Write a protein that binds this ligand. Structure first.
Ligand SMILES: C[C@@H]1CN(c2ccc(C(=O)N3COc4c(cccc4-c4cc(N5[C@@H]6CC[C@H]5COC6)c(C(=O)O)cc4F)C3)c(Cl)c2)[C@H](C)CN1C
Length: 285
């Protein structure tokens, strides 16, 4: 069995919560808090270990963007610091290829990174790789066919419908077909050989629309929209279905968790998070 882990987030200030949802029995485990509160981080798993990457601690005492990489072992219920990234990356995107973590874009104050760096858990080291063609914060990241895709975001001036992909063997990026919609702060994941981009902000409205990229045709197609429009949502895939967790809709910090079934092309509300929040990091293990 695997659980859906949600780390950090925001509600009034950046949060330290680490909770794990079991889709079989509907329960939430309350696990060890993060050592430093953070929102705008990303989560991922390598070798059964959960990683919390980047983010920002927005507290009553100030705002500090994070270059941290922290590792949580479900077997020990303990967080351990790892080697930090070259720069702080708030509103970061992350993807894993061959057990290596890619930290994509994100911001440090007013700096909107196009830089990308890769972590090796086997050496506890980060190294920069080729930078993206576009600066991207609030970026979605997907791994498909051993390529790393960076989708949407905000480049420091405009919110983006563009997307690009990274070729690890060549160490280079190329632009791909742009989405139908501009999405800054969307949830992006891969399911059944397709990239999904759900929600996000188009510059005027919080979105409930969801679109899917088909590699062979290089096209983005709309699929069933979510019940609740949201940005800064957590997203993951568990047992052939997509789960979206929380987020912000322009008025409320959502506790809604929706689940997308690709066989029926329908979204269903399956649980609530223990408290409404946005900007979480999510992963499954
Ligand atoms: C003081 C509070 C502070 N709030 C918030 C404070 C914190 C958060 C939060 O979790 N973060 C900060 O953002 C993000 C986080 C994670 C990923 C993406 C974003 C993000 C949100 C954006 N924004 C778009 C879509 C969401 C956000 C606002 O709406 C336009 C935008 C944009 O602009 O393109 C770009 C983004 F990369 C972490 C949020 Cl979501 C709200 C609210 C604004 C209410 N306020 C009263």
């Amino acid at each position: 069995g695997r659980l859906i882990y949600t780390a950090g987030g925001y509600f009034r200030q950046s949060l330290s919560y680490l909770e794990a949802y079991n889709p079989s029995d509907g329960t939430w485990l309350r696990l060890a808090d993060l050592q430093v509160p953070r929102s705008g981080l990303a989560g991922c798993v390598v070798g059964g270990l959960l990683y919390a990457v980047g983010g920002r601690n927005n507290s009553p005492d100030g705002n500090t963007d994070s270059s941290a990489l922290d590792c949580y072992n479900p077997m020990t219920n303990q967080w351990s610091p790892c080697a930090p990234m070259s720069v702080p990356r708030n509103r970061i995107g992350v993807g894993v290829i061959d057990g290596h973590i890619y930290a994509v874009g994100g911001s440090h104050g007013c700096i909107h990174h196009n830089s990308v760096e890769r972590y090796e858990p086997e050496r506890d080291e980060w190294h920069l790789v080729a930078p993206m063609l576009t600066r991207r914060i609030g970026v979605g990241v997907a791994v498909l066919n051993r390529l790393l895709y960076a989708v949407g975001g905000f480049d420091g001036t405009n919110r983006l419908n563009s997307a690009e992909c990274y070729y690890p063997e060549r160490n280079e990026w190329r632009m791909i077909t742009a989405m139908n919609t501009i999405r800054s702060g969307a949830g992006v994941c891969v399911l059944h050989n397709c990239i999904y981009a759900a929600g996000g902000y188009d510059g005027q409205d919080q979105l409930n629309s969801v679109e899917r990229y088909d590699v062979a045709t290089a096209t983005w197609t709309f699929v069933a929209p979510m019940k609740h429009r949201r940005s800064a949502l957590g997203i993951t895939v568990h047992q052939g279905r997509i789960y979206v967790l929380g987020g912000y809709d322009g008025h409320t910090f959502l506790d809604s968790v929706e689940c997308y079934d690709p066989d029926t092309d329908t979204w269903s509300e399956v649980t609530r998070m223990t408290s409404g929040r946005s900007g979480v990091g999510v992963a499954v293990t």
